[PDB]
Ligand SMILES: *[C@@H]1O[C@H](CO)[C@@H](O)[C@H](O)[C@H]1NC(C)=O
Ligand SMILES: *[C@@H]1O[C@H](CO)[C@@H](O)[C@H](O)[C@H]1NC(C)=O
Ligand SMILES: *[C@@H]1O[C@H](CO)[C@@H](O)[C@H](O)[C@H]1NC(C)=O
Ligand SMILES: *[C@@H]1O[C@H](CO)[C@@H](O)[C@H](O)[C@H]1NC(C)=O
Ligand SMILES: *[C@@H]1O[C@H](CO)[C@@H](O)[C@H](O)[C@H]1NC(C)=O
Ligand SMILES: *[C@@H]1O[C@H](CO)[C@@H](O)[C@H](O)[C@H]1NC(C)=O
């Protein structure tokens with residue numbers, strides 16, 4: 001039979017206490033929900049380890065071997081009802097053996113074998129195979145030295161066998177220190193998303209996780225038609241050589257060169273190759289090889305090198321300082337000594353001094369400026385077109401697809417290049433056909449999820465591909481992020497952003513929820529599913545233009561809206577010697593060589609810290625005098641109880657401010673007892689406490705409700721609230737009688753809007769997303785900075801104390817220099833990004849100060865500056881790191897249609913309205929204001945006369961009262 | 963010499979190690995010499 005191993009067989013990775021962490025590690029783990037083969041005693045393979053479990057006493061011991069005969073060592077881990085016995089001999093009597101160890105319900109084991117060690121882990125659990133999660137602890141590792149490719153149980157019969165694979169797990173550690181939960185980061189797209197964001201519960205949105213590749217299939221080698229074997233025998237085993245002043249040069253071409261007859265022997269005294277290595281010469285393909293052969297003294301062979309001095313390398317034989325080639329000499333004749341001037345490289349002169357001798361041969365490789373001729377024995381294969389392969393064209397390697405081309409090469413050219421030095425076309429050395437080279441498919445991978453509290457389904461966007469490509473690559477199992485439990489399905493949709501696998505296409509346009517790209521969104525609609533539509537810009541209407549009709553409102557409504565303004569962020573200092581070095585002194589002296597880094601960095605961070613307090617002072621400290629909150633909070637019917645503090649409570653905040661402070665959900669050292677951390681990171685406290693900001697906003701609300709608008713320009717002057725509201729109605733263009741006659745209705749609409757503001761903040765909707773975004777960005781910057789202290793940047797370890805306790809001084813200098821360089825770079829990145837984010841926060845605080853001046857201390861005429869409507873009055877409330885503005889506006893809401901005229905002609909002269917419009921009641925002509933319907937009779941007081949009535953287009957006849 | 967733009971292609975490089983400081987033509991119109 002076969003069963004599944006659901007979340008079983010996880011073990012403790014190492015021997016270190018951890019608590020309240022999530023830990024990402026790579027080891028050999030049994031993947032989640034994989035197959036097991038239950039037995040109800042065959043020889044079973046042992047590949048990279050197993051997972052053995054036995055539900056029933058009757059099973060005891062194992063035999064781990066290679067051949068399972070008397071010709072290979074085999075280990076027996078048996079139990080004689082009291083003693084665990086381990087032996088490693090040639091069993092079938094035993095002989096010739098090197099290990100011995102005797103020592104004094106579901107049982108579970110993991111056997112792993114690596115580096116000549118057999119790790120064994122064991123767990124126990126009291127209950128086919130169950131479905132729980134259980135964790136395994138180590139028992140013993142044994143220093144055996146044998147391969148294990150088979151195993152067999154020993155019975156004196158219900159056991160299951162899994163198989164381990166190299167995976168990545170994210171392990172959750174308790175507060176006590178035990179592993180309670182884990183995710184397999186290669187099982188689903190969602191599990192990869194959980195591992196990449198390092199959390200178990202994902203929010204809603206679109207997230208980028210990894211990148212995809214299309215792996216190669218074939219392999220293409222093309223080499224020229226060269227058959228003749230190559231004559232190094234003539235060049236090397238030759239009877240006579242010329243003198244060093246008259247060296248000879250021999251050209252080698254159209255030969256297949258072995259090169260293994262030079263470095264397989266001790267025949268040569270020296271073997272120095274420049275620009276290549278000896279072992280790599282059997283794959284490269286050169287154009288011609290030249291051999292310079294001569295005879296020279298013993299202690300002058302060192303002189304034959306790039307950049308030497310003397311007589312041989314000065315008047316006899318000079319090499320250039322870009323030499324690609326090999327220099328040979330072995331134990332076995334004049335030489336020039338006087339001439340006028342130096343030599344140019346590879347030039348000879350035909351004053352001579354006579355000469356243990358050595359024979360020297362110098363090989364220079366002509367590298368691929370022409371068709372290649374001289375290269376080693378590699379086989380050639382046919383070429384594969386329109387497919388991702390690995391190629392090798394005369395030593396020129398790579399990976400990509402090959403396509404017929406339309407370029408036209410000159411006969412002396414062998415390949416074609418690009419701007420960043422990529423070969424993008426090539427000539428086939430056999431058929432002389434031009435091929436283009438393209439990359440295989442790659443890009444990013446996005447995971448679209450509706451939160452991991454409403455579904456566990458996701459969709460995947462493969463960015464910027466045609467996805468018959470990724471459909472065929474998935475079905476042929478050829479993508480690098482290959483997920484074990486994942487089916488493409490029948491929902492594959494091509495967009496301009498790439499293509500979308502897992503979301504279905506509907507024809508109904510909705511407002512955008514999760515944006516994907518070029519007009520496409522996704523959402524979670526009706527079970528439910530993930531849909532993908534074209535976004536809708538707005539809800540349509542039609543208003544009919546006519547040349548003699550106007551629409552005038554017949555009522556209104558009061559609306560209170562909200563604005564969230566971030567103002568400041570959290571203030572940070574870092575100890576540069578504690579982050580970079582710690583307690584060490586060799587590190588301190590080594591870091592002293594870099595000038596002023598830490599002084600300059602502390603200066604930058606201090607400036608950011610001072611700027612945050614300046615922002616807060618600029619927004620809130622805008623009043624000269626502190627007005628006390630009134631005893632009675634009922635001004636003409638307007639209830640101010642929810643925006644002013646209550647004397648019957650211990651705190652200064654109001655009730656809405658309490659909601660706002662509960663809304664935002666806010667390591668490193670900081671204090672309030674005062675603790676510190678080993679990384680040298682703190683957070684500094686602000687100059688103005690929450691109580692002082694609450695005192696500011698309380699005095700602003702009190703001064704508004706008592707003096708109105710007059711304290712932003714001079715001293716405050718008291719005025720009853722209804723007369724203040726009548727002046728504000730007058731300022732938006734409505735007469736005061738509209739207030740005074742409908743005062744009760746306006747008070748009721750105010751109170752109801754305040755109650756809805758309260759209830760919508762209690763509802764736990766994320767209206768405060770900006771202040772949360774401030775919190776999140778700062779925390780993730782500091783987490784990246786602390787996590788950068790685990791990398792070693794090339795050193796043997798990332799710990800300075802290990803390097804300093806296990807190594808001498810002279811190499812500890814090298815390792816500490818590498819760690820110092822990497823950590824200076826990490827701190828520089830942190831400070832640069834903090835400066836840019838401080839600029840953002842300062843612009844936002846400047847806007848908030850402009851709004852407090854122009855909307856709390858006045859009445860603004862600017863359209864949509866302070867709410868949506870006609871602005872009346874506005875109120876400030878404090879939040880964590882911000883301010884919330886409660887704008888009160890006037891909305892004209894009902895309509896009627898009327899017939900209108902520009903002027904009316906009475907006797908011979910035309911009358912125009914003073915302030916208003918002429919409307920037709922249905923019976924007679926009245927005059928009314930624009931923003932409310934209040935018809936008045938047309939008199940001489942509210943009209944003016946200018947001209948004759950023959951010139952205005954659309955003038956009518958009506959009487960005008962005197 | 964006519965005025966214009968013309969482009970030249972390589973024909974052969976020779977691995978001969980003498981130095982050249984003088985040259986001379988061989989005859990049986992005119993010829994012009996510039997310096998690189
Ligand atoms: C931790 O250990 C204590 C025993 O001191 C136990 O009561 C508790 O359940 C354990 N687990 C957690 C999560 O605290
Ligand atoms: C080339 O040969 C001439 C012979 O007249 C000599 O003057 C010159 O120095 C030589 N070139 C070099 C680099 O020595
Ligand atoms: C190389 O050899 C192959 C197989 O013999 C032949 O088809 C091809 O024409 C040859 N090309 C050249 C350039 O010699
Ligand atoms: C506006 O509507 C309300 C509905 O409650 C009504 O009481 C009020 O009289 C209306 N105003 C006018 C001017 O008709
Ligand atoms: C003002 O509002 C508060 C909160 O709803 C309420 O308790 C109080 O009674 C109101 N004041 C009145 C109705 O005078
Ligand atoms: C026109 O005005 C008169 C004045 O009282 C009013 O009675 C009548 O209802 C108005 N006409 C319409 C159609 O409302």
Ligand SMILES: *[C@@H]1O[C@H](CO)[C@@H](O)[C@H](O)[C@H]1NC(C)=O
Nearest residue numbers: 905906907954955956957958
């Ligand atoms: C208004 O009255 C005058 C008086 O003569 C007349 O000429 C004119 O046509 C009248 N307007 C209309 C639209 O009938």
